[PDB]
């Protein structure tokens, strides 16, 4: 593999991941600033996810969209794998939500527009994304979000059961109840994120696994009084137990509440 560590100057850590750290870096010839994600092979192998990562990195290499984090390339040495990534200078949406507590309708509708645009592009490339979490949404220099999780699928439908994530909070009912799933997961994700952006917490959050499982399966959620009628309409249309009843992405992008509030 042709890139090598000696091609890069390394700067401060950008953060720590499950399998290594991510650093700010620049390529020596062009001085182009980027992020270098370092993963230890032995840790990937320990967790038994190295094969899956190779599948995902290959898929990611083809995706070129302003709201999808760009993978520029990769390389390896005896102990590590290096991913050469687009540097996102404004951090995660997760952190932004921590700082602001809740987003207003303009910021929310604009973010939902960016996600729907990204997901539309993905459909045109026939790749499926799985659940979307705020900690895996990064922010570019102009404040535009970037899907950063490499969580792609090429089986429609899929019976897959990744990821042993943190909670169930971002998973659709078909994924937690053990049924087949496909592109319609997209719309559930948009509903969960739209709610979380406006309210400050995802709609099925609970103190126990049991209660969260039940609320997702039953689609048990309520709105604080300040959530407006248009937001309620969109979110309620998105969070359908039956995936086939969820809207098309075009319907999200054309929803009156989105077009009224989105800056894009």
């Amino acid at each position: 593999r042709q890139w090598a560590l000696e091609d890069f100057e390394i700067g401060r850590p950008l953060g720590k991941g499950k399998f290594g750290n991510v650093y700010l870096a620049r390529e020596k010839q062009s001085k182009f600033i980027l992020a270098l994600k370092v993963l230890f092979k032995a840790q990937l192998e320990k967790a038994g996810v190295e094969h899956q990562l190779r599948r995902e990195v290959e898929i990611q290499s083809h995706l070129r969209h302003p709201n999808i984090l760009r993978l520029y390339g990769y390389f390896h040495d005896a102990t590590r794998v290096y991913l050469i990534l687009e540097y996102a200078p404004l951090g995660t949406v997760y952190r932004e939500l921590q700082k602001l507590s809740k987003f207003d309708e303009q910021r929310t509708a604009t973010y939902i527009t960016e996600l729907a645009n990204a997901l539309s592009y993905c459909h045109s490339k026939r790749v499926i994304h799985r659940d979307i979490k705020p900690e895996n949404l990064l922010l570019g220099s102009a404040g535009e979000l970037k899907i950063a999780d490499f969580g792609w699928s090429v089986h429609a439908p899929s019976s897959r059961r990744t990821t042993l994530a943190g909670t169930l909070d971002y998973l659709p009912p078909e994924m937690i109840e053990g049924r087949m799933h496909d592109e319609k997961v997209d719309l559930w994700s948009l509903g969960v994120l739209c709610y979380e952006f406006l309210v400050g917490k995802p709609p099925f959050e609970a103190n126990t696994y049991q209660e969260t499982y039940k609320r997702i399966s039953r689609v048990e959620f309520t709105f604080p009084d300040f959530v407006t009628e248009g937001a309620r309409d969109l979110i309620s249309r998105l969070l359908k137990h039956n995936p086939s009843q969820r809207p098309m992405l075009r319907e999200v992008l054309e929803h009156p509440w989105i077009t009224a509030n989105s800056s894009k």
């Binding site: 593999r1 094969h51 599948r55 083809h62 490339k125 026939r126």
Partner: protein
């Protein structure tokens, strides 16, 4: 001297027929266990993922370092260039040289 051998390099089929494309990673102990399939339709510039399901199916033969893609009930729309692409167990990029598929006849009609 590792090479991916993709066959057939050229295929002409009639509508309703089936096509199997094979990709084999030869002359290396590196394993081809992670193959994805891609297509650029004839006349188009957009490469697309071949999503598995419906008319599209795929197999892997770990013992022979191979992978296959089968398209059944071929349609004129299926005409285009097809490639297997993977990152092998040695973290090295592998791609087949491609299958140029032409679907002509046999009834439109």
């Amino acid at each position: 001297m590792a090479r991916v051998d993709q066959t057939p390099r050229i295929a002409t089929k009639e509508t309703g027929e089936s096509l199997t494309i094979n990709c084999v990673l030869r002359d290396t102990a590196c394993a081809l266990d992670s193959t994805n399939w891609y297509r650029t339709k004839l006349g188009s510039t957009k490469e697309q993922t071949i999503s598995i399901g419906g008319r599209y199916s795929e197999t892997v033969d770990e013992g022979s370092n191979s992978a296959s893609l089968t398209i059944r009930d071929l349609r004129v729309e299926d005409s285009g260039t097809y490639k297997c692409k993977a990152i092998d167990s040695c973290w090295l990029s592998r791609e087949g040289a491609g299958t140029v598929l032409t679907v002509k006849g046999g009834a439109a009609a």
